[PDB]
Amino acid sequence: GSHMATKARVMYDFAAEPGNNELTVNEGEIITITNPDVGGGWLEGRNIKGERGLVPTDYVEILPSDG
């Protein structure tokens, strides 16, 4: 929102599946959110390196605006 992407922090470590197009992440890591609602308990995001993928939204927390 407001000329900037949405962001999230990781709450627990995760590892992607190759046939599911998920994104591997570590606890406390910050990622940009690309899609906060995809169905099935997930969200779309990208890490610092520039990889994208699906992540379980119960493993992460959406960060505040105007920060």
Binding site: N35, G39, G40, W42, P56, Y59
Partner: peptide, 23 residues
């Protein structure tokens, strides 16, 4: 879609919660 979609429901999570939050 013309965007990324989950092939399965989300896995279970190791949240510390004997009982879930009221909020």
């Amino acid at each position: 879609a013309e965007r990324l979609i989950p092939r399965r429901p989300a896995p279970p999570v190791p949240v510390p919660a004997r009982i879930p939050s009221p909020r």
